[PDB]
Amino acid sequence: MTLAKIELLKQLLRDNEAKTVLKQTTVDQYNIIRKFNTSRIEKNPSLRMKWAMCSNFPLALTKGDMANRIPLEYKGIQLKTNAEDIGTKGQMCSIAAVTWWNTYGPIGDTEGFERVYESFFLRKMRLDNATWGRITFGPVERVRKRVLLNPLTKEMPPDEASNVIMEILFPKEAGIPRESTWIHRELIKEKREKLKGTMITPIVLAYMLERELVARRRFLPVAGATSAEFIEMLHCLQGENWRQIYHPGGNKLTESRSQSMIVACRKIIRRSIVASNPLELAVEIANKTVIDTEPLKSCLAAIDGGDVACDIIRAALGLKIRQRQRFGRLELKRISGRGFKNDEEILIGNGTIQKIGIWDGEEEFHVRCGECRGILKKSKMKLEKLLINSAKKEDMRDLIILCMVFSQDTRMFQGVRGEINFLNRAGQLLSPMYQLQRYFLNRSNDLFDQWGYEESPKASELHGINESMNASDYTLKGVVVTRNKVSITKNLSLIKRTGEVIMGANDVSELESQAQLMITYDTPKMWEMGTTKELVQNTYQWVLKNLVTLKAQFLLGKEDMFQWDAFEAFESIIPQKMAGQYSGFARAVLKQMRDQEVMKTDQFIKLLPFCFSPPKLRSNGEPYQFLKLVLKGGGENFIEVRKGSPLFSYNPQTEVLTICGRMMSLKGKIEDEERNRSMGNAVLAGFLVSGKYDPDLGDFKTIEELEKLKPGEKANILLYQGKPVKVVK
Amino acid sequence: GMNINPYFLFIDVPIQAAISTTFPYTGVPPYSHGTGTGYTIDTVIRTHEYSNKGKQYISDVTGCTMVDPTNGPLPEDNEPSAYAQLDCVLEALDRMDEEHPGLFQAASQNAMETLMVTTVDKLTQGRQTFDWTVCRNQPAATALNTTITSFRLNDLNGADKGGLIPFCQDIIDSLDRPEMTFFSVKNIKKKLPAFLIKRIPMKVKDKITKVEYIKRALSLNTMTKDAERGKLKRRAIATAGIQIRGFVLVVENLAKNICENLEQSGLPVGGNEKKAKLSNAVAKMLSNCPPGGISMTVTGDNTKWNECLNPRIFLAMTERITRDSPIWFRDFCSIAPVLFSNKIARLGKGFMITSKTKRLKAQIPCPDLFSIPLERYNEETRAKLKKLKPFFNEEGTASLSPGMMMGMFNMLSTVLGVAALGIKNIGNKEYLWDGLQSSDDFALFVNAKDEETCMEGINDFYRTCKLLGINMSKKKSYCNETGMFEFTSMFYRDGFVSNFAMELPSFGVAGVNESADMAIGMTIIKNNMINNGMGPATAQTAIQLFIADYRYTYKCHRGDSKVEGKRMKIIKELWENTKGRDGLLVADGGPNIYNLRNLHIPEIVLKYNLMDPEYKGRLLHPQNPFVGHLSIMDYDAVSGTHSWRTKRNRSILNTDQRNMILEEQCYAKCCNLFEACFNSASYRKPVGQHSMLEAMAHRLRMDARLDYESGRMSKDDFEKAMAHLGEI
Amino acid sequence: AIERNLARMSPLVSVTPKKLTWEDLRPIGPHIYNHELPEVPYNAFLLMSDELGLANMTEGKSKKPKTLAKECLEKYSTLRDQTDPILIMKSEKANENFLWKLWRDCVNTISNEEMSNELQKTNYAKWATGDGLTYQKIMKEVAIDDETMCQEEPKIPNKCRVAAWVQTEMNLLSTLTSKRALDLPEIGPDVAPVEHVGSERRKYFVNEINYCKASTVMMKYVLFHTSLLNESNASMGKYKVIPITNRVVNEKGESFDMLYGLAVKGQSHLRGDTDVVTVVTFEFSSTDPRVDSGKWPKYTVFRIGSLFVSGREKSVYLYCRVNGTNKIQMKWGMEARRCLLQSMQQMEAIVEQESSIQGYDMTKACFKGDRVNSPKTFSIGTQEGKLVKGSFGKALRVIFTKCLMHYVFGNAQLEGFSAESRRLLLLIQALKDRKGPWVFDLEGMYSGIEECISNNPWVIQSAYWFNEWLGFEKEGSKVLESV
RNA sequence: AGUAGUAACAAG
RNA sequence: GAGAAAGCUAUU
RNA sequence: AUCUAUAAUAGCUUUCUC
Ligand SMILES: *O[C@H]1[C@@H](O)[C@H](n2cnc3c(N)ncnc32)O[C@@H]1COP(=O)(O)OP(=O)(O)OP(=O)(O)OC[C@H]1O[C@@H](n2c[n+](C)c3c(=O)[nH]c(N)nc32)[C@H](O)[C@@H]1O
Ligand SMILES: [Mg+2]
Ligand SMILES: [Mg+2]
Ligand SMILES: [Mg+2]
């Protein structure tokens, strides 16, 4: 309507004020004058709406032919203002007018609504074609992670998505053709051919496309299912004390399945390596493990990939291992070489020191990136060699940078100059290697300049390549262009036919992560695969449920009440270095409680799960002494021997046991004489309370000053705040 | 008889687990009535009371009486103290810089680059802003436009460049102008027989002198805060004009860049991210407690946070933080605390004097406060006016050099608090403190060998904060063993508990329209399920309560109900006519089919398959007149007929606005024509330093050329179009 | 620099830590025990435990409010036809004759055959609503010249002592009744097992809540505020009669309409959100105001007749009161149903905790018990100075009544008291957990708390209840000083 | 009157 | 007459 | 490994003097 617009402009330029506004206001100042409003927006719109819905004509009608089809009156109900305010005033109507339109109004085509709101219809399809499992009541430990809100077709950064939308819907008024936007060119074309004759208003289409192309990531509490298909049902997924099994519809990406498979395999390994015959337990748990909806074995077979734990589970289940790794855009498959990851402090080019886990030893990997292939030999903190096959240039340099940051060498570390942070805004750790990989994808120029060069080799079919993306006389150090049954033992170690061990259970990562897909362990002992807080709560609840028989067995027997399945699950969250020492300490404390008949139910309950691992005494036979017993993961996961703890606290006034925030009444299964029973009898191994505070001895002795005391020696031990007590060996 | 005691619940349940019962948010929030001048004068008096031991002088720029508490005598009691020591502030900032190398430089660089890429229209992103041209309050875009028009009148054109830096340069150059010509508003008053008074506004050219303009540009307009929960007494808030908002943005951005990278800052994290950060910090403090020792947490708030913080200290902080920046950026970051150090407070609407015998009342404004003998005021107002008199300016405004009037430097104040938190120790004593700071609320974690050394550390922290002009409230703070505390209304008891009552006011009908309210209410229920401990039973009950309130608000009860109403007749007719009754929307008398699982699907999509074809066609009619259709050729609106708009025709009584409406309509027509020419202007903000007329003319010329070359227009109309384009 | 400055700062600048003990926790607001102060009067907008609903078995049709009131008054024709005033009590600055004339005008306007509930602008109606009571606004110059025009000293809410009627209301509103007033709409069908669990829990929770008097009171408030807002907007310059009505359901399922009284709306030209419209309320009751005169200083009570439920009749009184409301209060009264949510969420969470400890749903066990688990009990109150325990449902009703009272007696005094007393509650919890709390200025805490205790009945009663609970906590901690 | 509570409304 | 900042939600 | 990036409007919550 170019002619109509020119006529409109000529009509508008007939006033001195419109002419002044159009001539003086710049195009930037349009964003100012479009918001011009001499009146303040009414506050409290809920009150305003409740007030206006009781009025006669609260709604505004757009003047036109469709408004005229509404009668001024209908059965004695006035639907709109009379013909007095057709001009210069603005027509209004009642809500009965809207209801009349929905009842006796003209009927139009409901096409265009289906395309604009197609994302919501896909959401409804996923909900309807979904299966609901059973509901479980028990502790759920939720971590607050940044997760994707709704599933997306092609996740794009908002700037690139804005440019793509601008290309699709407003190609004439678009601007400079940014290079990145050409990457999605094909997609752009498709959308345009689908919107050639759409009469929907362009801005609604723009926000439809933005809803289809822009990710919305928010911090949310999650527990074990972080894929967007589960995030959209998060509210029905779980609470703090219940879980609901949900199987969403649609099709799931292979990345989610691989990540969930790795998480499940790691959890199974962690649970298994603590039991007698870990192979049998690992196989039993793996045979009843379901990833989303398929069994674990099928996912292991169908997916070529994984990590060390995945290969261990594959061997245990009788499948073939695939020593192939992933580095985001790099796929590495090991050939030969065993190494260990050790965490040391590493300097970076910015001068910052970061605690990084670097692998030691010499190893070789066949590496692939898109349509690029090569081999890579590396040593500890020193890159050895990278042979490259012929491939496309950008993929070539991407593979080069991915391999050179994979080597974990000093040149790469000191070639980092800029702004790199390994901490989340919420103070959560980001994996340093992945962050460096992400950084060097857009700023590899500094890396290549820092790397250096040398003279090219002069072999037959070998030539050197430079960052100048062309055949150059100079090549950088390390890059060379070339144009052409395992049996798993009882302790979950993979050995060849010869005797050499490829990978062991100690090689699995210690990281606790949330699976993208919901993992289900169809076994009555599912809770043994939970997190640390859930495991502690379930173990202590089991102890409370069987308290009477445990106490009877302990007061009659000596050793058989220390070996139980619940305690075997509990041992998997005790760090293995301290498990034996904790067991020795706790066994000594319980034995000294029994011997002198001083029995404290709260302390017996608290220290019973720790008496499961084989004891580890000191040279003299005396057990180690502790103030608190640390558990895996998080700084709040510990058990205080004397006082309360975030995981275990006891109130003798109410006789109430607080375990991980849940209150259990110990009343009834307790003698009130224990309120008048000294606590210090069950705080130290081989120590009994003698009396009150003695100024003769002086300061309260610490653990290291107390383990070295000879028998029969007095000492002052502070039980808790304001309770000075003297103790004797 | 047995008497119910509700507090006895706390015998069975710990307080944190039942903290929601201590938030009476089902009741009406307090509201203020009448003037806020009393609270404003109280604020001025209190602000000057904590600095009266400082240096008092007379400003040679405006003539106001200025008080400078910085580097004043150290306090000798526990009363609020505004005497921050410059050297101590510098030492805290230097310790912060040593603990986080390159933090200040990175923050300065980011702020400078953002300022370089910042446009003027950013200033339009505020609420009610003091307009100096009319000496009133106007929306931010209107105030900015009036400022730009006035600056154009005064031969200042920095806004035409489009960036924030030339606009700020023109602002500080306007401060040097000996005279200021602008557009103000005059109200013609008419004696309407009925008698009443009719007001008709019109714009006129006004002029002010240099000092008068400077005082107006430095003036803050004060009003009263409504609907605030938790406070017995009401309080006044303040708003600044364009001249100050232009410069506060950059300092805010710099301090935000600093705060993002501090492990002790509670800002700008919020919600679940803030909860995760605080939980990780608490866990870290628990792990790092020395063996055999004790740890204390102090739940603390700072009393008189805004009245004691001094903008001169902020000037020093900005000079220290931007140490390695170019000179121009350092000056730019120095402008804002300087303008705050000379700020002038507008006292408000005044006081109303009444004669009860004659039933008469009249409003005495702030300029006329001292035209009445002080014996004609209340006792409290008389005392306040007597204390106010030295700082009172004969224009009805007060000099308020000390203090920050209301929350303008939350980020920079947080930086100062975190710097206090970063000292960690005094004199190598046997304790170590850390903690979390968010604005003025704080949690202090002190690890030591026993309780006495912990209290020594808390005392040292209190005194160190005194050195920085920060006063910990001994009344509102307390200390206990670590593992249980409070921070910004979030209660930690071995993990943050859920406070459901806090979100209770959000569960009502929002009041946008019938379609939007349903989606908003269901989304609120879903999010409260996710992160407020709202169980499935409570969520289903919330669905029921929302549906009941929705039906009573929009008068859309069930079609088979016998409720009388103007809409209910047609709703019953639709119910009888419709065959697929389960597909009717709740706003049209249909049943509610929402439950827990489908809480995230919009209502129309959820009922689309159950909908009658005739009802579906009527509801989703692309040309229904209840939704505004964009036009210069009408487009298709895909949302249904329930997306209507209650066009807010604010007819404030006894005032007939005929000339403000004229200018607003002129702007609206120009912008609508611009959108017609540039269809993308509503999606992406257009850029360019040229006139809108030339941009539209070139776009129209290109469109005419292209649609003539494609055969969409004939020769004759193309000749007419090119003739009209050339006539421009 | 910091070390040097702290070396010279006066030692008087101190945080003065003091270790909190039970002996250091004193009762809040001692003046509420001072008998020289008046008992706090009843200031709620409508009657709560003294309400009397005239029941009329409805035929399932929502006919109309005026028609409903006409039918209810036709059923109780003796009360309707009483035309002489038998004054029982008179409000101090009130006109009994004008109030009775207004009541008769209401009855006649609601009993006639016309379809309009508008009243005429008679002298008694003008007095009751308050007509021409606004002060005339003059110009500033005239007022400045006039030495009689002075700033008015603000009224301060006076100090009152504990009144036993608040305890009696708490006891009565949390008691079970035989009528259901909640009108919860339909919900979508259940598919997921979590939805089935939610519905199973909702059965117990809303069955316990639906049969308490507090629920009927809440519905009365909600419906009346809806009607009042609608009438105020629709009839700005008219006096309208608005019946106070409810719809209840028996255990047999038969629906009744309850007429609790009538109301008159004055002129409602509410420009601002704090602008007041006067509502003159005439409520039926069977409580004799002469039993507790200190409760009813705001009410003019006539005895209008007698009613029969049993072999002994009960007097029917008409409590008449001039009252006021604004738009904010009406809007927040329309959404008082949310008093349910805060009540049941707090309780549902408790149930959920137990489930996590047991591995299965514990709603039936918590409410009624089962073979494995005994019913859950809570300390709910005192009888003869001794702790008394009630069921889970009783505690749920108590929490619901507490939220209802938060709405009914809500103002700035309640907000300030809630905040300050919450700080004190956190200190007391830290004391109970043996966290060894330390204070810096406890007298300041108590002064901040007591600043808000003036004349809100719920705040004064909450101070009394807090003192009683604190005494019980001290007595319970006296045994904890032995471990 | 009353609502209300440090100041207002009780129409302009 | 109803401000600043942060988080979240809805909408165009 | 979500780390980057992120138009405007409106609402809600929190904090910001007693
Ligand atoms: O999400 C986490 C993890 O589950 C996921 N991940 C890890 N491995 C895969 C595979 N193979 N496919 C899909 N997803 C995978 O990515 C995150 C990694 O966290 P985590 O496993 O805890 O990392 P870890 O501590 O185990 O190793 P890290 O050094 O951070 O690097 C992870 C990744 O890189 C491999 N890797 C790097 N280097 C330098 C290696 C080396 O020298 N030798 C070997 N054998 N591997 C090296 C790691 O092994 C992993 O493959
Ligand atoms: Mg404060
Ligand atoms: Mg605090
Ligand atoms: Mg605070």
User: DSSP assignment of C168-183, as one string?
Assistant: HHHHHHTSB-S-B---
User: D5 C1' – C264 CA distance, angstroms?
Assistant: 25
CA distances from B694 to B201, B368, B625 (A): 32, 51, 34
Q: Which helix (H) or strand (E) holds C201?
A: helix C193-210
Buried b (16+ CB within 10 A) or exposed e, A243-268: bbbbbbeeebeeebbbbbbbbbbbbb
- Distance, CA of B436 to chain centre: 23
Q: Is C356 in the B-facing interface, judged by CB distances under 8 Å?
A: no
Please provide residue A586's backbone torsions phi and psi, each rounded to the nearest 5 degrees. Answer: -65, -40
422-481 on B, CB < 7 Å from strand E: none
Residue A239 tokens read as 């609470």
Please provide residue B327's backbone torsions phi and psi, each rounded to the nearest 5 degrees. Answer: -60, -45
Residue B235, annotated as binding a ligand? yes
Instruction: Please classify residue A445 by burial: count the beta carbons closer than 10 Å to its beta carbon, then call 0-12 exposed, 13-18 middle and 19+ buried.
Output: exposed
Q: How big, in percent rounded to 5, are the helix, strand and coil portions of chain B?
A: 45, 15, 40
Q: Are B164 and B246 in contact (CB under 8 A)?
A: yes
User: F2 C1' – A225 CA distance, angstroms?
Assistant: 16
In ligand 1, the atom with minimum distance to the C-alpha of A307 is: 11
Contacts 24+ apart (CB under 8 A), C468-472: C468/B5, C468/B7, C468/C382, C469/B5, C469/B7, C469/B8, C469/B10, C469/B11, C470/C25, C470/C27, C470/C428, C472/B8, C472/B11, C472/C387
Residue C171 tokens read as 């006891």
Numbers of helices and strands, H then E, in chain B: 23, 20
Mutation test residue for ligand 1: of A261, A364, A431, the one with most atoms within 8 Å of CB: A431
Measure the CA–CA gap between A51 and B92, rounded to whole angstroms.
Answer: 54
Q: Which helix (H) or strand (E) holds B727?
A: helix B715-727
Q: Are A665 and A659 in contact (CB under 8 A)?
A: no
Please provide residue A441's backbone torsions phi and psi, each rounded to the nearest 5 degrees. Answer: -70, -30
Domain boundaries, chain B: 31-261+303-408, 262-302+409-496, 497-646, 647-728
Side chain identity, residue A495: I
Beta strands C239-249 and C255-265: pairing type? antiparallel
Given an 8 Å threshold on Cβ–Cβ distance, is C14 in contact with B508?
no
Ligand 1 contacts (CB < 6 A) are A 258-259, 262, 305-307, 325-327, 339, 357, 359, 406, 408, 431, 433, 509, 511, 513
| Residue in B62, B78, B56 with CA at minimum distance from that of residue C12 | B78
Given an 8 Å threshold on Cβ–Cβ distance, is A137 in contact with C360?
yes
Q: Are C296 and C285 in contact (CB under 8 A)?
A: no
Side chain identity, residue B307: E
Torsion of CA B144, B150, B151, B152, to 10 degrees: 110
- Give the distance from residue A136's alpha carbon to the nearest chain B alpha carbon, in angstroms: 14
Given an 8 Å threshold on Cβ–Cβ distance, is A675 in contact with C479?
yes
Residue B131 tokens read as 């307009």
Given an 8 Å threshold on Cβ–Cβ distance, is B4 in contact with C170?
yes
Per the entry, the structure determination technique was cryo-EM
Buried b (16+ CB within 10 A) or exposed e, B219-245: bbbbbbbbebbbebebebbbbbbbbbb
Measure the CA–CA gap between A127 and A100, rounded to whole angstroms.
Answer: 33
Side chain identity, residue B468: L
Query: Among all chains, which residue has been given the structure tokens 């029917």?
Result: C316
Measure the CA–CA gap between A532 and A144, rounded to whole angstroms.
Answer: 16
In ligand 1, the atom with minimum distance to the C-alpha of A310 is: 11
Q: Is A89 in the B-facing interface, judged by CB distances under 8 Å?
A: no
Side chain identity, residue B107: A
Residue C81 tokens read as 């036809």
Given an 8 Å threshold on Cβ–Cβ distance, is B354 in contact with C151?
yes
Residue A376 tokens read as 């890579």
Measure the CA–CA gap between A584 and B255, rounded to whole angstroms.
Answer: 53
Q: Are A198 and A168 in contact (CB under 8 A)?
A: no
Residues with Cβ within 8 Å of B728's Cβ and at least 6 positions away in sequence, in order, are A9, A10, A13, B693, B697
Q: Are B125 and B76 in contact (CB under 8 A)?
A: no
- Give the distance from residue A246's alpha carbon to the nearest chain C alpha carbon, in angstroms: 9
Q: Are B642 and B587 in contact (CB under 8 A)?
A: yes
Measure the CA–CA gap between C24 and C14, rounded to whole angstroms.
Answer: 20
Measuring alpha carbon to C1', the residue closest to nucleotide E8 is B271
Q: Is A233 in the B-facing interface, judged by CB distances under 8 Å?
A: yes
Residue B302, annotated as binding a ligand? yes
Residue B709, annotated as binding a ligand? no
With vertex at residue C476, the alpha carbon angle to CA C474 and CA C478, rounded to the nearest 5 degrees, is 70
With contacts defined as CB-CB under 8 Å, which chain A residues touch B707?
Answer: 2
What residue's CA is closest to ligand 1, atom 32? A327
With vertex at residue C434, the alpha carbon angle to CA C433 and CA C437, rounded to the nearest 5 degrees, is 100
Please provide residue A331's backbone torsions phi and psi, each rounded to the nearest 5 degrees. Answer: -110, 115
Q: Are B597 and A236 in contact (CB under 8 A)?
A: yes
Please provide residue B4's backbone torsions phi and psi, each rounded to the nearest 5 degrees. Answer: -75, 130
Looking at chain A, the residues that come just before a C–N gap of over 2.5 A are: 484
Side chain identity, residue C106: C
Beta bridge partners of A80: A93
CA distances from A277 to A266, A489, A521, C385 (A): 17, 10, 20, 63
Measure the CA–CA gap between A172 and A178, rounded to whole angstroms.
Answer: 15
The answer to whether strand E lies under 7 Å from the CB of residue B216 is: no
Residue of C43, C68, C149 best to disrupt the B interface, most CBs of B under 10 A: C149
Q: Is A49 in the C-facing interface, judged by CB distances under 8 Å?
A: no
CA distances from C310 to B426, C55, C313, C475 (A): 80, 15, 7, 46
Residue C92 tokens read as 């101090």
SS3 of B33, please?
coil
138-157 on B, CB < 7 Å from strand F: 141
Q: Are A288 and A275 in contact (CB under 8 A)?
A: no
What residue's CA is closest to ligand 1, atom 31? A433
Please provide residue C73's backbone torsions phi and psi, each rounded to the nearest 5 degrees. Answer: -70, -30
In ligand 1, the atom with minimum distance to the C-alpha of A306 is: 11
Measure the CA–CA gap between A93 and A74, rounded to whole angstroms.
Answer: 13
| Residue in B391, B341, B346, B367 with CA at minimum distance from that of residue B136 | B346
Instruction: Please classify residue A337 by burial: count the beta carbons closer than 10 Å to its beta carbon, then call 0-12 exposed, 13-18 middle and 19+ buried.
Output: middle
SS3 of B2, please?
strand
With contacts defined as CB-CB under 8 Å, which chain A residues touch B604?
Answer: 113, 117
What residue's CA is closest to ligand 1, atom 25? A509
Measure the CA–CA gap between B49 and C36, rounded to whole angstroms.
Answer: 38
A499: left (phi over 0), alpha (psi -120 to 50) or beta: left
Q: Is C411 in the B-facing interface, judged by CB distances under 8 Å?
A: yes
- Distance, CA of A58 to chain centre: 48
With contacts defined as CB-CB under 8 Å, which chain A residues touch C328?
Answer: 47
Measure the CA–CA gap between A85 and A67, rounded to whole angstroms.
Answer: 14
| Residue in A137, A360, A93 with CA at minimum distance from that of residue A245 | A137
Beta bridge partners of A471: A465
With contacts defined as CB-CB under 8 Å, which chain A residues touch C357?
Answer: 541, 662, 664
21-50 on A, CB < 7 Å from strand E: 40, 42-44
Q: Is A675 in the C-facing interface, judged by CB distances under 8 Å?
A: yes
Reported resolution, Å: 2.6
Sheet with A688-691: list strands edge to edge. Answer: A688-691, A724-728, A714-718
Half-sphere exposure of A361 (CA within 13 A, CB side): 10
Given an 8 Å threshold on Cβ–Cβ distance, is C438 in contact with B19?
no
Query: Among all chains, which residue has been given the structure tokens 């550390």?
Result: B457
DSSP per position, A244-277: EEEE--S---HHHHHHHHHHHHHHHHHHHTTSSS
| Residue in A427, A145, A350 with CA at minimum distance from that of residue B261 | A427
SS (H, E, C) C240-303: EEEEEEEEEECCCCCEEEEEEEEEEECCCCCCCCCCCEEEEEEEEECCCCCCCHHHCCCCEEEE
Beta strands C136-137 and B360-364: pairing type? parallel
Side chain identity, residue A126: R
Q: Is A501 in the B-facing interface, judged by CB distances under 8 Å?
A: no
Q: Are B112 and B329 in contact (CB under 8 A)?
A: yes
Side chain identity, residue C481: E
Residue B156 tokens read as 């200042």
With vertex at residue A165, the alpha carbon angle to CA A162 and CA A166, rounded to the nearest 5 degrees, is 85
Residue B32 tokens read as 């203020």
Query: Among all chains, which residue has been given the structure tokens 């827990």?
Result: B596
Half-sphere exposure of A512 (CA within 13 A, CB side): 17
Contacts 24+ apart (CB under 8 A), A453-460: A453/A477
What is the number of residues in chain C? 483
Q: Which helix (H) or strand (E) holds B284?
A: helix B271-287
Q: Are C298 and C91 in contact (CB under 8 A)?
A: yes
Q: How big, in percent rounded to 5, are the helix, strand and coil portions of chain A?
A: 35, 20, 45
Q: Are B442 and B436 in contact (CB under 8 A)?
A: yes
Given an 8 Å threshold on Cβ–Cβ distance, is A137 in contact with C482?
no
Query: Among all chains, which residue has been given the structure tokens 């009689």?
Result: C148
SS3 of B486, please?
strand
In ligand 1, the atom with minimum distance to the C-alpha of A263 is: 4
Residues with Cβ within 8 Å of B334's Cβ and at least 6 positions away in sequence, in order, are B315, B318, B319
Cβ-based neighbour number of residue B119 at 10 Å: 18
Radius of gyration of chain A (CA): 35
Give the nearest chain A residue to B587 (CA atoms). Answer: A99
